[PDB]
Amino acid sequence: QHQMFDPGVADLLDTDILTSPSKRKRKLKSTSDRSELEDYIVLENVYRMFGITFFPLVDPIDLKIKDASGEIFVDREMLGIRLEVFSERTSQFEKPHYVLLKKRIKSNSWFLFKHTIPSFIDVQGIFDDTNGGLVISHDDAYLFAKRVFLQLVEVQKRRQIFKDLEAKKIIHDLDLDLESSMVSFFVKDIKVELFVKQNEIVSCSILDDIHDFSQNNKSKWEIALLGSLDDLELKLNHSFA
Amino acid sequence: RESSKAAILACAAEYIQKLKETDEANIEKWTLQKLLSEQNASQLASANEK
Amino acid sequence: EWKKQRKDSHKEVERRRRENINTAINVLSDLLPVRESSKAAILACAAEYIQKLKETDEANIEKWTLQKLLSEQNASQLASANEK
Amino acid sequence: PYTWKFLGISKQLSLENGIAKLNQLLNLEVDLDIQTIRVPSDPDGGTAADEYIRYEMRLDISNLDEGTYSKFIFLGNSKMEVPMFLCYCGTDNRNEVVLQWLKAEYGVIMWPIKFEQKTMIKLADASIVHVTKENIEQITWFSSKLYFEPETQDKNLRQFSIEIPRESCEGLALGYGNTMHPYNDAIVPYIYNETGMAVERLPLTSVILAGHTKIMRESIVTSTRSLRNRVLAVVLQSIQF
Amino acid sequence: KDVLDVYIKNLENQIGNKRYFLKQAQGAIDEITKRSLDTEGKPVNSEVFTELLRKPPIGFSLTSNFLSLRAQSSSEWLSLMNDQSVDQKAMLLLQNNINSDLKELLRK
Amino acid sequence: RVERINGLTNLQKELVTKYDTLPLLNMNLRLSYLRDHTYPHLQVSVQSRDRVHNDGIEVLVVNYKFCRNTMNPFEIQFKMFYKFEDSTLLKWEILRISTNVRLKAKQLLATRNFQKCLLSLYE
Amino acid sequence: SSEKQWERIQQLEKEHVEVYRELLITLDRLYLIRKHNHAVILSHTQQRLLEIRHQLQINLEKTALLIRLLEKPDNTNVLFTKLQNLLEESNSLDYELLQSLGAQSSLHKQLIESRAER
Amino acid sequence: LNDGKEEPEIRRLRLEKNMIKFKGSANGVMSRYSSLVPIEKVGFTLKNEINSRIITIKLKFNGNDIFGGLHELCDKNLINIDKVPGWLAGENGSFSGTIMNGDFQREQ
DNA sequence: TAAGTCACATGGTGCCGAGGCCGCTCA
DNA sequence: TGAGCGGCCTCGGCACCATGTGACTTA
């Protein structure tokens, strides 16, 4: 036994810390609380599997003390939402888009403070369209969140369909813009370029000209190629053979 | 119309504030009158419902 | 000098006048809806806002007359329906 | 636009005697003026030993600009560690002859005066309080402009200014209360509370009062032909040991 | 880097144990101070201090910190002392020159 | 003073040591948000998060009980297979559907991308 | 990230030696007070011997697990290489100290004779 | 405003605090003061209402990187990082505007 | 005659493209 | 040793507010 202390002073010194680590750990600050936090994290991931979630947020500037006893209260309440779209092609969750709403000081209504959504999705116009401008309840915030998450779903689904068309080797090398709307690809050598709106092709253009290729059949193909994206894939694989 | 530009700008500010105050007063008075008319219409509509 | 002291006093008077003009411009910009920087922009926006407030007052007068007509029509029609 | 260069003096030199030697050396009569001012007339600024001795030496030839109007202002108090400083405007080459004569006649040690940040704030406080012939003090409000030139790596932030209008300055002063040092008590704490900047720590190169004066770290330039008593007094307490 | 991390954990464990022993020791000494109303210190018996003199990874920490800041302090002592010494050489060159000047002035 | 904050930190203690723009780590507050504000009237429940650590795959079974119509709420039960690192959903299957929503959910769940399925069921 | 580890273990060892020294001092004064009633007015000649026994315990422990690590050269642990780095920087500057001290003392003698001459 | 050789662990934490406030990340988006986008000129016009008086403060900036320089000034304890507002910290960067009621609206 | 309003003409701060020399700088 | 890019930097033209003084009016 390593008796570190003199016997004259070991009586008033608590030596039991070295024997029991639990005594030290309870004299600093468990495993059941770890279990409940563990289940809480799993449940939060289950909720975030939905795609549209609300998370609490505090701006550090809006932290002030009430000076009664030192209770730090948030001055302007914030609300941040995240939009996790599920990319089925990679079977992965894409990186979240965060929209943060702060309360107006004088009107008690959320306003579009910060957002991480690109400019081809008019998040300010969607937010102003939600409940005719001002939003108060969490229902209006969720409605704005759903309205912009539908745009995220639209761009991700369109990019997924075109990337799957590339992966099946049906079309040759293609170019995608940021929202996957203005595209161009080769089926055999014909440069088919498309302007596509939400899950529906509204414009088509066949560009490459072959001496055997005609123009009335080209116009008929352009009219036939319009419609839905799945219909475009089916009819393009049909006309390929 | 004033002579000095400072008085012109001060009277412009006072005119803007007076226009805002008159608009607010007219809105409040018309809101009260519309509330009275809506109360009468609602009570007669409840009588029609019965 | 006497004339130098007179020039200094007139200089101070002109400086006070210019500061009063700038203060009035800043007050008028504080009453403005949208925030402007230059003096000419502040004056043009103030003229536009005064004309807009005049149009708003006339439009509100017309709107109130139309609202009174609608309320009179609704009251008379509801009374007629009650009698019927 | 009369720049005042400031120099301290190691001894309390008496100017009403021996100035005839300067008149003989310069071949011209100077207009020495003697005044006994009491600058901290406010009760909170001191009620005893407030008297100063103000000398206004003037190389008077003609009055058209500072080429013949390089004034000299001396201030002194015998109850201080350092008893005297001078400040002189203009750009005449006779001024350094006057300084050399002052040294070689009185045996004084003269060094240039540099103002700190709090010294510059106190000087901006002093340069608005104006004494009236009715023996009252008037605070004339000027639209100040604090002007900084920080030194950062890669010259990231070369300079930045803080412009404060006149009516905002008097609004801050009235918000703080009845005080006779507006910049040090109301303006600077408001700047620190709002923007987080401690301007007594930041490198402050000049504060500019529009139409009246713009003091710098080494010089004070004033539109007014003279320098008021409060500025001279604050400079005198600035160089104390 | 895992061995460095676990040794960091071991040394912070030892530091926390020593902080515990400090806290208990100072609580005991403060309790004895409270129970002793005598403000004036009693003269210490030599025999008690004699009996104290007969009775009783730390040293790695001791030698590491000691040698490291010892080398650092010696290096900066060279810096300051060499600046002071070259200042002394310059001052002595000037002083010997003006000493020769005053000697010549005395002779003349 | 240096303080360590975790998922079980008090709200006041978190606001004491808040100088970043990251979301609050008070996990009770996070789940209170998730339960009361973004998805009210939904009694979610997880009961088995067992793992096959040899493959590094997590098996999760959750029950979604959409209790907005409290008289006859319809409930569903999923089974997810995680990847637990380089997160890929290799397989998901529907363990049990309540019979009063079974046909509409049978037409909806035939397609993949179960995030759309959960959002569509809640909507 | 190794430099972060060395910096971290540096302030940890600084706090370690500080807390051990003050812990030893508090333990010995606790023994002194618990054997006595309130005898805390011990003279300088006794506090110095307390400091002496502290110093010899410190350097005895340093040598004691200096025996433990330097007896068999493993040449694989990085603490071993830390010991040779610390030693080779400790013993490097020893001669230059006395050389500079002697040179500056000769300078001081030159100051003395120049002052006497002046 | 009241306050030397502070502990190197908590000094690293306050450096990390300034880094977080001015660049968003603890390690930054990666000398080290260089922001994601250097900004040359910004001018903010902060307006408050102190007892029914509109009090405007016009802060103008100039340099090669405004917010990197402000971060360096915050590291030198010249600007309080606990009181530096959002718009000064680099939020809505390269936009100059008026801060009324705590909300930043850009100029036109 | 002291004070005020006025446009007027000059002072001045900030800004930027052009271009030059410098300042290493590297083969 | 020799070409060579980059921060510096000043010229100066432009843009805008700032400014001091005479002319003129008010009391």
Coordinates of N, CA and C in Angstrom, one line a residue, chain C residues 1 4-5 8 11-12 15 18-20 22-23 26-27 30, chain D residues 2 63 140-143 165-167 210-212 223-225:
Chain C
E1 N -8.1 93.8 -35.0 CA -8.7 94.9 -35.7 C -10.2 95.0 -35.6
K4 N -11.6 93.2 -38.7 CA -11.4 91.8 -38.5 C -12.3 91.2 -37.5
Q5 N -12.6 91.9 -36.4 CA -13.6 91.4 -35.5 C -15.0 91.4 -36.1
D8 N -15.0 88.3 -38.3 CA -15.2 87.1 -37.4 C -16.6 86.9 -36.9
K11 N -18.6 85.8 -39.8 CA -18.3 84.4 -40.1 C -19.0 83.4 -39.1
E12 N -19.1 83.8 -37.8 CA -19.8 83.0 -36.9 C -21.3 83.0 -37.2
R15 N -21.8 80.7 -40.1 CA -21.6 79.3 -39.7 C -22.8 78.8 -38.9
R18 N -25.5 78.1 -41.5 CA -25.3 76.8 -42.3 C -25.5 75.6 -41.4
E19 N -25.2 75.7 -40.1 CA -25.5 74.6 -39.2 C -27.0 74.4 -39.0
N20 N -27.7 75.5 -38.9 CA -29.2 75.4 -38.9 C -29.8 74.8 -40.1
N22 N -28.2 72.6 -42.1 CA -27.9 71.2 -42.0 C -28.7 70.5 -41.0
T23 N -29.0 71.1 -39.9 CA -29.9 70.4 -38.9 C -31.3 70.3 -39.4
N26 N -31.3 67.4 -41.8 CA -31.2 66.1 -41.1 C -32.5 65.8 -40.4
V27 N -33.2 66.7 -39.9 CA -34.6 66.5 -39.3 C -35.5 66.0 -40.4
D30 N -34.8 62.6 -41.2 CA -35.3 61.7 -40.1 C -36.8 61.5 -40.3
Chain D
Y2 N -5.4 78.1 -38.6 CA -4.2 78.6 -37.9 C -3.8 77.4 -37.0
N63 N -1.7 93.2 -40.4 CA -2.8 92.3 -40.2 C -3.5 91.9 -41.5
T140 N -21.2 75.7 -26.9 CA -21.6 75.8 -28.3 C -21.4 74.4 -29.0
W141 N -22.5 73.8 -29.5 CA -22.5 72.5 -30.0 C -22.0 72.5 -31.4
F142 N -21.0 71.6 -31.7 CA -20.5 71.4 -33.0 C -20.6 69.9 -33.4
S143 N -20.8 69.7 -34.7 CA -21.0 68.4 -35.3 C -19.6 67.8 -35.3
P165 N -23.3 64.1 -35.7 CA -23.9 65.4 -35.9 C -24.2 66.2 -34.7
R166 N -24.5 67.5 -34.9 CA -24.6 68.4 -33.8 C -25.8 68.1 -32.9
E167 N -27.0 67.9 -33.5 CA -28.2 67.6 -32.7 C -28.1 66.3 -32.0
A210 N -16.8 70.7 -36.8 CA -17.1 71.3 -38.1 C -17.3 72.8 -38.0
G211 N -16.4 73.6 -38.6 CA -16.5 75.1 -38.6 C -15.8 75.8 -37.4
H212 N -15.3 75.0 -36.4 CA -14.7 75.6 -35.3 C -13.2 75.3 -35.2
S223 N -10.3 77.7 -36.6 CA -10.8 78.7 -37.5 C -10.8 80.1 -36.7
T224 N -11.0 80.0 -35.4 CA -11.0 81.2 -34.6 C -9.5 81.7 -34.5
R225 N -9.4 83.0 -34.4 CA -8.0 83.7 -34.4 C -7.3 83.3 -33.1

